[PDB]
Amino acid sequence: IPTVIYDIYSRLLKDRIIMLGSQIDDNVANSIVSQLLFLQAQDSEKDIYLYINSPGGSVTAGFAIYDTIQHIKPDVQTICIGMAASMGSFLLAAGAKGKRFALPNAEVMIHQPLGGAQGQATEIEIAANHILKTREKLNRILSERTGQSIEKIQKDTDRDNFLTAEEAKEYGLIDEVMVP
Amino acid sequence: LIPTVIEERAYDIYSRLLKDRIIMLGSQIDDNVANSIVSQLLFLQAQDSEKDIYLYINSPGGSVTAGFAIYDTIQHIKPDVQTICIGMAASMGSFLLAAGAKGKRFALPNAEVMIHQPLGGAQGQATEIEIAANHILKTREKLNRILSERTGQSIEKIQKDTDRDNFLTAEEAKEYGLIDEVMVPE
Amino acid sequence: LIPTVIEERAYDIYSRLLKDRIIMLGSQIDDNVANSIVSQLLFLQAQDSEKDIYLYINSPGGSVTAGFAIYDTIQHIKPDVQTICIGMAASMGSFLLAAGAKGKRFALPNAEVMIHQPLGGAQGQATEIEIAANHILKTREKLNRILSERTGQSIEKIQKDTDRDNFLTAEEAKEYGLIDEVMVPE
Amino acid sequence: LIPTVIETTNRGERAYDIYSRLLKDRIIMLGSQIDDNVANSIVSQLLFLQAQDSEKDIYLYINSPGGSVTAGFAIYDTIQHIKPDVQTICIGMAASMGSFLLAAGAKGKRFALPNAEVMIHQPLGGAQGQATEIEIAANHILKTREKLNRILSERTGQSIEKIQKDTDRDNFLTAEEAKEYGLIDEVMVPE
Amino acid sequence: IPTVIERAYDIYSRLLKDRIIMLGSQIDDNVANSIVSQLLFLQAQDSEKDIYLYINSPGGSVTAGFAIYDTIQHIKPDVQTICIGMAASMGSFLLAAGAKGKRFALPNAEVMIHQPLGGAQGQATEIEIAANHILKTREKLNRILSERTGQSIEKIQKDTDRDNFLTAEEAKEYGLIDEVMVPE
Amino acid sequence: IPTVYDIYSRLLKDRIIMLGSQIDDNVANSIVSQLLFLQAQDSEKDIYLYINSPGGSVTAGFAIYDTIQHIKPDVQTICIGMAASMGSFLLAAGAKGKRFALPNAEVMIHQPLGGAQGQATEIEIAANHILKTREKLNRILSERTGQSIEKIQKDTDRDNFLTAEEAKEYGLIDEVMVPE
Amino acid sequence: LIPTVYDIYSRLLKDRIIMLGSQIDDNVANSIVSQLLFLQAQDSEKDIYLYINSPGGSVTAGFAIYDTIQHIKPDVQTICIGMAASMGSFLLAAGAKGKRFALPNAEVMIHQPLGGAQGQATEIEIAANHILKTREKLNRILSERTGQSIEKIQKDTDRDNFLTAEEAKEYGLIDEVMVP
Amino acid sequence: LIPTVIERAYDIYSRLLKDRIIMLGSQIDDNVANSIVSQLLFLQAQDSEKDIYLYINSPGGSVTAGFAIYDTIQHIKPDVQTICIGMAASMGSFLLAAGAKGKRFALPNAEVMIHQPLGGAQGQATEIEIAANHILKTREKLNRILSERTGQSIEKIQKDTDRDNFLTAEEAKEYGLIDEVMVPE
Amino acid sequence: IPTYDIYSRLLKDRIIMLGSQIDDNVANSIVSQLLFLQAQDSEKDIYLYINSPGGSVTAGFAIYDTIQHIKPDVQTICIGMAASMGSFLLAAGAKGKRFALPNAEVMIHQPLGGAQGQATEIEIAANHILKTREKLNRILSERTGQSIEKIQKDTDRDNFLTAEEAKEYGLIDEVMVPE
């Protein structure tokens, strides 16, 4: 990671740019949540810029970021550069309305949540109910953010569904493709 | 490891027992074990469709579908299949113990019987987990319904008593209706 | 592990069943299992080209090409091959269950039948992935077409019903046309 | 991985990692599995913050799957011991000892964001060896469960019998259900 | 394992022909199934002649041990027991299970008694169930040992709290065996 | 393996040889031995070679191939299940007019696979060897199918799956045995 | 490992030189994207110099870099030193027209994208369609940047195709070979 | 992982050390003992009269490492107050009991566990004998010191440490391992 | 193993081969062979070949006690090596009928073992292995004519003896010199 006279990521944070550039786990969420809180305290009115190049990851970690975005006063603009898959694409769609972007060759992928369960029948049932409720929660929020029905979201996320930047715009996941 | 007996014919000990209509279920129940036991049951029915068969059970259980292969074959054939628990019958083992001919399900006094709900796993997409969950729940309903019919206990009581590992003495298994008699030594 | 029976002649239990025209498909289907079953079918046809053969199926499935070795050999030989599901017939196992002679496909009441689409893999260059994808899609079409002919269901319905794991009871398998009869115990 | 922030003050600029910057404003992040190291760090932060100012509130962020019960109790007892109120917020997930610590915040100052997940269940453990050693371990984990349930009862207003029943297996609650249960006081809805 | 020819037998099968069963390993389900089968075979061959159970075993599974124990008590023939080498844990329990008056050891054989071993992991209630089960199992073992030795349950409990090694002569004094066979 | 003889030995008594696995040296040695045994038993009666094989070693395959051509009896071939790579080469090696498949059998043809590491000159030697091996295979396949070497080269460039009927049209087999 | 003068890479960044000297993954892309953004903010008119010595890597990570290059105002000059393979050679070709270079002994390699898929037939189909669309996207852009037809790019990338610096120039991947 | 505070820039543990608080928050091995011994020596040199505060959240560990800490506590002039937060087991509970008389504490939900020392030996009979004698002497040494610090007899300590013995904070006080449970205000 | 297999052929002539590490399986087999041979003929000598690095003490005692229990004399011969429990069993043969070939190696040393866990568990294990060593040394004293104190000293560490030194020690009666 190069230094500027700051490491490069810290330099970007000084200009209110947060980089979500990896798999989403609890550590990544904690860092992004902290950066959002720091930026709101520095200036509660200026926009924040969230860069997303992520294959997704933990749903609860993703919701930590999602809820923090909605909680703070500044608008959080989102941009997909490279790829936004799974919880990554969910967070892309979570940006301030009118301020969700992708570059033209960026890839957006949506699909249903993944998980596991082992043990007794009743334990498997509890895990199944939990992941099904989690999917309903995700689909409901995605419906509100895209303007698509819950039934359409359900159908379109049944398997891996790859979208171009332009298709993501048509879907309502982003507002604009930034053409060079 | 397995001794031979000579009667002129040479038999390993298990084959010698099979000649007297005794089948040994002495391991974890998987497809191989089920196939072997199913084959022995079919062989014995063909040898004599009227004489009792004796199924020895010392098993920690195992695959439910493999257990049902044995269960359905027991019910399908004409001979009565007597069951005895020696050592332990747990899970599908205890289900098979309860599957023996009415009046002919036994245990020795220090045998251990354990009943519990089925175990499994699932990973992948939400809808795949749902399918696996529905399947294991239906399997549990099927097991509980049959156990209710075989023991005389209600489905609601079976559900409650199999929620966690439930260890029974031979005498408790008799009181429960899983077996008919404890063979006390003379 | 596998007991012996003595009639002058000494047989393992499976060989004894084969003498009465019973073939046991009791494991995952791979090339070895297919070769053995194909050999048994050819042997039985040569022993008697008119008497029925009995194919026991307790299998989670396995290789599609191995399954087709068995399927084609069943159709090629003169004797009718009766099929019975005891325990489980999943994937290629359920395909082979459905391949038995019309009117002579059975299951015991607690047997489980599962149908789903074929599984596979591919890695390498885009064009290699394309070739592998085309191959598995053609394989699925071939399976679905044959299943349609054997069950009486449309190809479109088979496609829909095999999209994910679909578990059927013995009675549901009969209603579907995978088997002809559930053998209820007497 | 962890960004730096630089604040220019009148006696030279200061460089903080982001978590240290939050600690300066009395925010402690419990963002991982709870083990002894995590507990020691959080205990130290609580003691430091009390010494800096014994009257100002502390803010404990909880995004945790839980972990060691004794480590969790190190944090719990330190929270109750110090003078400042410790506000708690669930962001993401609070499971097991995480949800216990969420419920341990100052009364009226326990929060969650709307899509946060709270999970409660009974403690997990292990025991091997002789029969009498297994008995000792069993008695210990059963007493530990009674201790947890009693405290949870006091903090939520639910009876011990209800806590026992509701923690028998994994029990997932929405933020709103956690409020109704008494684990938190308020769901912070976005403005 | 050598062969002997009269018909060809492996050495263990040859001993089984003279009603000698060898329990010469750790006790698991396979060993128990084999020994149970041999006992049933021998009873069917002759319901009146004594059976001879050789024990050189570090013990093993309690339920497997009880399969053997209950089969011994169930059959009509007397089962004589001898400790050669070592009988530990369930091995020593089976040694004590032989027909009264017909439990032996050779002079340098080692007998060890101790409480049962086990494990449990998972939820508190699962640990409780496992603990209750192993405690009941210990009570069952101690009660039977009390009946077979003539020692009180309280003394058995105390003496099995930790590993307790006995010489053949001490095992006789304890009531685990009836006689030490001294060489002529 | 059931007894009647083990089942495979019983089939060998009726001049049926089972090639039902990956082709390695052990399999080739066994099949070569069976062919020599059968020729000695009767030099005029047909032999029946069952093929359900994913292929394997080229030199092992050539041991079988050359032994088939060397002996006096006609060797009939049948594909049941799958004949891939050297398996399909051996299928095509059966006596002209006596190469069969069952209707759902799969035939796959492709170029040989291999490996080489070390110095540049060692890599060159290995490359020349595998290229010569491919030429040898293609030339023989051309003679057995009636297809040109140029067409064989093109059609084996990547994995090429054929149905039994397509294998007949290609000239790899003579007839599909339809069930009566 | 990395000498100080600033560490050496940060010193080069001060003069608007970015080093892409490794396999392209998300971390590398995020770092390069950040450097490009930083440099544009420092001076939106001065050229940027992108050094490429890379075996390639992730396609989506490569597209993060590609789209950021096209998005920013400064011209990004590219030079191949050592090797540019796969996505590395794609990025080499993405430099400002007239300002794509290689040193004389640099190696350029082009080939089709690599990937994988396992699971159900329909999942394999989705993965196959995705990688085929990705290849079309890459080939279309390469056609625009080189002046070669899509059909020629398809043919020339079917297998590993190694080019000298001079051949890369003739192909249109670079504009000039810098002779010493 | 470990946050920084600015007054000078300190990691949080160093900041606590400036106020005479030492954290024993892990398994006790030689490294941990060396660090704690060094902190104790540093603090005595800074001020030989002011109390030191030793936080204990530890499952125990090496007996000799524990004795390095124990002997250093007794050697230095300042009183070392001890507090159990979370758990003090085995050598951890021994060190808890080693604090200055009247200044050994626990928080109400802290767990104290006492048991006999653990170890191992393999090799020749005479090597096993040497290892057995050593661990038995070590147990006698531990029990004698625990007797002096708690007021319990050696015979009672022996009996109560035969197996794992878990105590609540209040039970630890009754036992004499600590002097007071700090109840929250 | 060449073909009776060769070992079974030797057993027909009352020769038992102890040619490996002594564990429970080996002991069970040798005990069974001894019982079989006594039943075949209670008066004829048995010949026990010993080429063994030793092994389990309790397994060795299974063999030892069975030798002493049966009526036939058991002659012992060391060919190759008899170490540890192997040398103990060599010394256990019938008095006057314990042999070695001239280049055979005999090694004596104290028993080996292990203990882990609580102090009291280590104490129990230590007491047990010390009592086992006393039992071994007492029997070796009776069989060799050496004092217990001398056996203790000489087994403190690995002590290698030639066949002739083993004879002088009293572990064997005779070295069979080739004719």
Ligand SMILES: CC[C@@H](C)[C@H]1C(=O)N([C@@H](C)c2cccc3ccccc23)C[C@@H]2N(C(=O)NCCCC(F)(F)F)CCC(=O)N12
């Ligand atoms: C400024 C109002 C809302 C935003 C409020 C709030 O909702 N939180 C949340 C995000 C929060 C975070 C962590 C722990 C919490 C515990 C209880 C309640 C809220 C908590 C903390 C937040 N606080 C700050 O953000 N302070 C400035 C810190 C700046 C920097 F990030 F450190 F640089 C503490 C004062 C407070 O009332 N809030």
Ligand SMILES: CC[C@@H](C)[C@H]1C(=O)N([C@@H](C)c2cccc3ccccc23)C[C@@H]2N(C(=O)NCCCC(F)(F)F)CCC(=O)N12
């Ligand atoms: C002769 C009374 C008792 C000994 C009685 C009995 O309790 N069992 C038990 C041990 C038993 C074993 C295995 C499965 C059983 C199933 C149900 C009931 C008893 C079973 C089986 C036993 N049987 C035999 O022992 N038959 C001869 C066996 C010969 C040989 F071992 F094969 F060589 C079957 C007839 C029967 O009534 N019993």
Ligand SMILES: CC[C@@H](C)[C@H]1C(=O)N([C@@H](C)c2cccc3ccccc23)C[C@@H]2N(C(=O)NCCCC(F)(F)F)CCC(=O)N12
């Ligand atoms: C005697 C009526 C029922 C019992 C009937 C039957 O249900 N099955 C079942 C168990 C069966 C087994 C295996 C494959 C099958 C395939 C299709 C239908 C039933 C099958 C086979 C069974 N058959 C035999 O058991 N024959 C004798 C074999 C003796 C020995 F086991 F080999 F020793 C074939 C004649 C038949 O009509 N049945």
Ligand SMILES: CC[C@@H](C)[C@H]1C(=O)N([C@@H](C)c2cccc3ccccc23)C[C@@H]2N(C(=O)NCCCC(F)(F)F)CCC(=O)N12
């Ligand atoms: C009886 C007519 C058809 C059935 C014909 C046939 O289609 N095949 C097939 C199944 C076949 C099997 C294996 C290799 C083959 C190779 C080429 C052609 C057919 C083959 C072999 C089959 N043959 C036999 O099955 N003979 C009896 C062997 C019985 C036993 F299995 F050994 F017990 C060889 C004589 C033959 O003309 N056929």
Ligand SMILES: CC[C@@H](C)[C@H]1C(=O)N([C@@H](C)c2cccc3ccccc23)C[C@@H]2N(C(=O)NCCCC(F)(F)F)CCC(=O)N12
């Ligand atoms: C029968 C004429 C040709 C076929 C001739 C021949 O080409 N070979 C070949 C196949 C061969 C095989 C193995 C080693 C060889 C060594 C040198 C030359 C040929 C060899 C051996 C073959 N021979 C036999 O096949 N003998 C009978 C064996 C029958 C059975 F297989 F054992 F059942 C030895 C006599 C011989 O001249 N030939």
Ligand SMILES: CC[C@@H](C)[C@H]1C(=O)N([C@@H](C)c2cccc3ccccc23)C[C@@H]2N(C(=O)NCCCC(F)(F)F)CCC(=O)N12
């Ligand atoms: C200057 C107009 C375009 C270039 C515009 C833009 O398109 N992006 C992109 C590259 C962008 C990056 C990261 C996150 C984003 C989130 C939403 C929209 C765009 C984002 C961010 C970019 N911004 C900056 O580049 N600010 C200066 C940062 C300098 C330094 F790198 F920190 F040194 C934020 C203000 C803005 O409107 N843009």
Ligand SMILES: CC[C@@H](C)[C@H]1C(=O)N([C@@H](C)c2cccc3ccccc23)C[C@@H]2N(C(=O)NCCCC(F)(F)F)CCC(=O)N12
């Ligand atoms: C301020 C009153 C209570 C809170 C009191 C106390 O109970 N503890 C506890 C938490 C404590 C911590 C660590 C070891 C202990 C050992 C024995 C007793 C208490 C201990 C330590 C606490 N002390 C401090 O907190 N000093 C200031 C340290 C500030 C900073 F954290 F370093 F930044 C030591 C003086 C004292 O009497 N206490």
Ligand SMILES: CC[C@@H](C)[C@H]1C(=O)N([C@@H](C)c2cccc3ccccc23)C[C@@H]2N(C(=O)NCCCC(F)(F)F)CCC(=O)N12
């Ligand atoms: C002041 C009397 C006692 C405390 C005396 C002593 O007993 N030790 C002990 C603890 C000691 C420690 C390390 C190595 C030793 C080697 C030999 C003897 C004592 C040693 C060292 C101790 N010394 C210091 O503590 N010096 C100040 C160091 C302060 C700081 F820790 F660096 F911050 C050296 C002068 C000395 O006589 N002692």
Ligand SMILES: CC[C@@H](C)[C@H]1C(=O)N([C@@H](C)c2cccc3ccccc23)C[C@@H]2N(C(=O)NCCCC(F)(F)F)CCC(=O)N12
């Ligand atoms: C002269 C009697 C002494 C030798 C006596 C005896 O001490 N044992 C011992 C070795 C023994 C072995 C195994 C189990 C025993 C159980 C209880 C008592 C002695 C047992 C068994 C021994 N027996 C035999 O050795 N019979 C012949 C067996 C021949 C062959 F080994 F099978 F080839 C059983 C009859 C008996 O009374 N004894």
